[PDB]
Design a protein around this ligand. Structure first.
Ligand SMILES: Nc1ncnc2c1ncn2[C@@H]1O[C@H](CSCC[C@H](N)C(=O)O)[C@@H](O)[C@H]1O
Ligand SMILES: Nc1ncnc2c1ncn2[C@@H]1O[C@H](CSCC[C@H](N)C(=O)O)[C@@H](O)[C@H]1O
Lengths: 318, 318
């Protein structure tokens, strides 16, 4: 399971955003106490120590918690950073904390996310008015024309001019097995894939009352946009940003218009591509939900209407 | 399961080698009959038709056989190319064939390979003295210093100079979970990863008597080489080439010194890296075997001796 951890640390967008987001709240943190929810190899808890926190409680449910303690002691912080195995729901802290830091976002923000555990620790261990790092998250959606997908698909109709065998029929086949499903696809896109202006359909203040509730009811909203031009619409892409309070706030973004993160994007393919043109109106509603299977697994309910085609519904799951 | 098929056709090294290997045996094929063992989307069977074969029997055990028949008819060959579902072991051909063509090589040549089915069809359906495309395969091994691996590993000792947190201890951890296992790793290397001259340890004439036997006993041999210089030896890499008879023969190679194919290479990591230097002698024996679990799954038995360190044994499986 190392691959997941090198991928995080090699994500300098993620790592620096947190380093700086923590540093810039040095005033809120200095000589105070932090709870790091899901500390992994512990780097965040050490950032907090370096921002002058008097004491940091690094709680990590997985086996990797042993590296963190090893990472803490190697960094000379066995005295102020305390690593604690076990889920945060039942860990026992000696005191309540001034701030929670956590890297809880999963793919599509909420897949296999620790947001619930963060809120739990907020209720149970965070002092009144306490700090949350990051403090909010915004969710975005844009229609896409996946350039990688168009290449994969249209390629079978290219085989003739490369080897002299017509394999055009395989494009139907490819489409059905690449788009005619309802899984959520994690793929990194670029701006060249974006087909209308990105629309922010939800905002979560982490500290706000009722958030655990909405997480269970479904997080989302409606959206409306106009295509940039003519292409096959392949579906939609969802991503997020999280914001650290400052001064001007530090934002960590996973948009395809911004530098690539390990989160990439969550793609919602239609069952087949749709020809769109300049100023084709697309609207709909998009909802992130727990799976009845397993709330750890992200469900996304999409209702969309393309131009004046009839409105459709597609129900995705990770 | 489309991904496997686009990956083959987008492998122009594989596809062109076969196209040309088939074409160059036009004299052997023209107006004669071919059996294509494991025809997939059928492109090979059409190459044969284009090389003038009077009749081609495309046998494909998976569901994809329907695309092939669709591919054949779209290419106007419903009359000479016959697609037949079901394993080749029990298909019923109207006649015996003049030639077998097959893309039977799997990762490490023999993982999930159809070599046995090819030999079966050779015995049952191939006329006396009949043609085999490809006709032989050679196996190669070279010691490697995996540059990607060295980066992954040494990176934890770099974290300090990038974020100011010492994470050197995670290098031990990474090593154990990246090398302290016995799976065969499929990875594409380059020549920059090769650490001594590649050694060919086995040759299989596909047509030769006793081959099915050796496949069950184990295919391999000893090898001896001398390192190019100072680096961490991470283990070995196995690959293959197959040869089409011609004139000078056409060779399709999966060596890291040659253009990348979808087969890449099969890597055999030691439990930890070994410092080697210029002219460090490395020898050993390497054997490809069926797994007792499942002969479809490739097993590789490595015995090696590095310099004058004691000889070691490592038993890998896909
Ligand atoms: N309820 C919970 N209590 C404690 N840890 C949890 C948890 N749910 C998930 N986790 C852990 O939270 C971690 C998030 S990924 C680790 C990120 C960490 N900030 C780092 O830099 O390494 C995972 O290790 C996961 O095992
Ligand atoms: N015993 C068997 N009989 C028939 N097909 C088999 C087989 N064992 C494996 N196969 C099939 O052989 C194919 C090899 S991959 C397909 C390669 C093919 N030449 C192409 O260009 O598409 C796979 O589809 C696999 O399903």
């Amino acid at each position: 399971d190392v691959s997941v951890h090198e991928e995080m640390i090699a994500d300098q967008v993620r790592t620096e955003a947190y380093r700086l987001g923590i540093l810039k709240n040095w005033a809120a943190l200095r000589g105070k106490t932090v709870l790091d929810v899901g500390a992994g190899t512990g780097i965040l808890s050490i950032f907090c120590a370096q921002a002058g926190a008097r004491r940091v409680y690094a709680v990590e449910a997985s086996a990797i918690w042993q590296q963190a303690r090893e990472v803490v002691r190697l960094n000379g912080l066995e005295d102020r950073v305390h690593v604690l195995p076990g889920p945060v729901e039942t860990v026992e802290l000696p005191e309540r904390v001034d701030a929670i830091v956590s890297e809880w976002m999963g793919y599509g923000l909420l897949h296999e996310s620790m947001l619930s555990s963060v809120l739990h620790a907020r209720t149970k261990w965070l002092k009144e008015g306490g700090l949350l790092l990051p403090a909010s998250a915004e969710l975005f959606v844009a229609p896409i024309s996946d350039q990688m997908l168009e290449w994969r698909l249209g390629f079978w109709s290219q085989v003739k001019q490369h080897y002299g065998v017509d394999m055009s029929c395989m494009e139907s086949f490819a489409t059905r097995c690449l788009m005619g499903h309802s899984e959520i696809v994690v793929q990194d896109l670029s701006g060249e894939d974006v087909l209308a202006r990105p629309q922010r359909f939800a905002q979560l203040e982490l500290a706000r009352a009722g958030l655990e509730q909405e997480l269970e009811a479904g997080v989302g909203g409606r959206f409306r946009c106009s295509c940039y031009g003519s292409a096959p619409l392949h579906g939609f892409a969802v991503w997020f940003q999280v914001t650290f309070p400052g001064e001007k706030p530090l934002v960590l973004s996973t948009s395809p218009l911004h530098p690539a993160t390990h989160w990439k994007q969550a793609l919602l393919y239609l069952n087949e591509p749709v020809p769109v043109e300049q100023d084709t109106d697309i609207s709909g509603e998009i909802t992130l939900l727990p799976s009845p299977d397993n709330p750890r697994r992200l469900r996304i309910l999409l209702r969309y209407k393309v131009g004046d085609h009839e409105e459709k519904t597609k129900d995705f799951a990770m």
